[PDB]
A paper describes a structure:
The gamma-tubulin ring complex (γ-TuRC) is the principal microtubule nucleation template in vertebrates. Microtubules are formed de novo in a process termed nucleation, which is spatially and temporally highly controlled by γ-tubulin complexes, composed of γ-tubulin1 and associated γ-tubulin-complex proteins (GCP). In most eukaryotes, microtubules are templated from a preassembled γ-tubulin ring complex (γ-TuRC) that determines the position and direction of microtubule growth. Here, we used cryo-EM to identify and characterize γ-TuRC assembly intermediates after recombinant expression of the complex, which allowed us to delineate a comprehensive stepwise assembly pathway from a stable 6-spoked core to the mature 14-spoked γ-TuRC, identifying successive stabilization and conformational locking of γ-TuSC units as central principles in the assembly process.
To test this possibility, we specifically omitted GCP2 and GCP3 from the expression system, reconstituting γ-TuRC∆GCP2/3. Coomassie-stained SDS-PAGE and immunoblot analysis indicated successful copurification of GCP4, GCP6 and γ-tubulin with 2xFLAG-GCP5 and negative stain EM in conjunction with 2D class averaging showed reconstitution of a 4-spoke entity.
Residue numbers in the entry:
A (entry chain K): 253 to 291, 300 to 422, 448 to 502, 509 to 631, 636 to 657
B (entry chain Y): 3 to 41, 45 to 93, 101 to 177, 180 to 279, 287 to 306, 313 to 447
Write the structure that this text describes.
Amino acid sequence: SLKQFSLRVEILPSYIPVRVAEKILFVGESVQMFENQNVLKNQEDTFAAELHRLKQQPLFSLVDFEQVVDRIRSTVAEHLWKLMVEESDLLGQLKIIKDFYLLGRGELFQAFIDTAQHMLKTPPTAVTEHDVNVAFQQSAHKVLLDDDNLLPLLHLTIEYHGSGWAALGLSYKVQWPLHILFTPAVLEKYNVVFKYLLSVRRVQAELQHCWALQMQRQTDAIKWRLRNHMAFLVDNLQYYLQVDVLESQFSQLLHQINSTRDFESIRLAHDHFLSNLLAQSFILLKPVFHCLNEILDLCHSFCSLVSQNLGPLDERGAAQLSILVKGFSRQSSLLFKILSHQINSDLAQLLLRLDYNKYYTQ
Amino acid sequence: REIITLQLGQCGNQIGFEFWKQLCAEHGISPEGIVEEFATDRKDVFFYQADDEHYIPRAVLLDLEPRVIHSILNSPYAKLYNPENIYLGNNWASGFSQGEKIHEDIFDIIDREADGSDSLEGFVLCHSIAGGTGSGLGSYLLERLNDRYPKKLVQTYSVFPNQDEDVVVQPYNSLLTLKRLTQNADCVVVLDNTALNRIATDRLHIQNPSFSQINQLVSTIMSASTTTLRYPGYMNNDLIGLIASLIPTPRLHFLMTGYTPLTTDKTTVLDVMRRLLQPKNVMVSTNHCYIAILNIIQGEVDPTQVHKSLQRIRERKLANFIPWGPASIQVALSRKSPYLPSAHRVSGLMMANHTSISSLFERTCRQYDKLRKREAFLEQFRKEDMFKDNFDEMDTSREIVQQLIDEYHAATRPDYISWG
């Protein structure tokens, strides 16, 4: 079912510890998602015999009960881990989630950003959710998974009426009898971090298209200090930082799920994995998250300046350029305070703009 | 994205043929193009997906008075490529005048290969400065690519003529082609005859057959620089985003290219970065410092060592740069190729902009000026007379490279609101 109803303390004896109740929750919810779809069933009578033995004891003690529940739970988690890793391909499901929600295959989504910006504007409730899904699945059908991917239904913030490139949803329906590792809340949090990673990919892609300044293009208040060059190097370095944090957590997750044989340990590693991704990709509220929001806005306004000028020409662009250099210095000290948590990805950099202090003294 | 090699010059055609046999050994392919049984990865950066999984390499062969095509004809690499892409002097001006009259059909060849590819983003050139046939024709081809394609890239993997003062006509040709490379090419990877020859004499025991080992060195360098494009990583695998971090100064686009195995026949990333920042491991020839550094490490690498190596490299002040911005040293990772026939799969590369190359450019700024004062080595060729009557194009090239020197020295300063 999993339309289950949870085990809480208005209805639990309060002398029974809670941790036993979430373990019993695990055991029962797996029985729910195999009673249906018949158009752990080899040892159910042993479990019934142990429950009858627990009924037989007139002076209950909690420690023996906890040991019996642990004895049930170990075999339960072993059966669930063996079934869900082998027959339903749990590693493949994690790879699909990494490719689509955490953007482990950023190539297809980069081409999707190359084909659409018009949802920098806002959606009215009929129409544009169809357009994002059709365009994304066709641009995926050109090359690199033509056979599949007609299964993610792309929603942005298309509940309709607000921007959406920092707010692209994604709904992918998982196998519910064969995978209870994924919950709707887990997919919801993956959807939020998917929104965040979309925004940074958009802004870096637009700025490298203006690196065509270099495929195409007077000094001192024309060449926007070529601050195309000053802006793109530091944004691309932070892009590499989000890169190596996503790979570090994903590789740790795959080794962790391969090492152990209990499905509860898979779930603890999975929740730890998503919590680390949220903490380290600056989804958590910090001044570092404030810095990344401002660097997104600075890159977007900067690309809007440098796209329409073609070659070097003074279109009264110096008035924008002054705001750009001042915000550039403010987020300069802020990417200094990004720049090392105690986590090797976020630690990978407080030497990388702190050395000659053109952003510590300017 | 996808780039098409335009080989020109004698050593340019040699490194083109060496590059294609290097990629034939690198990928799991036959010398007909057919997929093997030990070869999913991407094979679409230099190869069209032709008829029977024939990964046909997209290339343009240009020269004058053909020499190397005979060696192509009696080899199994006339059965790998050439469905019709092979086109058949000694000075820059003669090559310029010869390329002027046949600009139509070579531009038709460029259009044919651009229509052949599926995603055109840049034209990469495997060229040799003062290779004979390459001088003049290469610069005119650069002018044609700049005029016809301002929206695409021009990449030049090239060697530059330095003999430590041999041939007395090559400084004029190299300075004119260098001015054409500044104004009409988008990125230049610079190499030298003395640097590659000195490292070849160091790691081996040769001195006379320099060309055949320079072919191997340039092929390994070009394969290392395009390893992340040919074999899928997930950082900046388009050429535009990769060279976007590589050029910090928009006129100073000449990049240092080091390679930690000089011969490919254990190590940490800290040690090869300390090796790789030293100029003795670099195949490229006062206050000199970088502007921005990037390095690419491919092999059996632990990523937390890339962390600690970057930390210690920037803090111990061996990344030497005084920029007018925050531009810094950058780490980058790549996956080493599955089914390399080469052993010892740990290899490192650096792509950094250094002002020390200006000093080497200053040698050319000496040489032409010296050969303009003696006046027996401009040689008074008539093609140079019909190229320009006043001979002020060489003075224009000297002015452009003098601006380049002053821009290197201004990029050493914390101000680039003033260059000379």
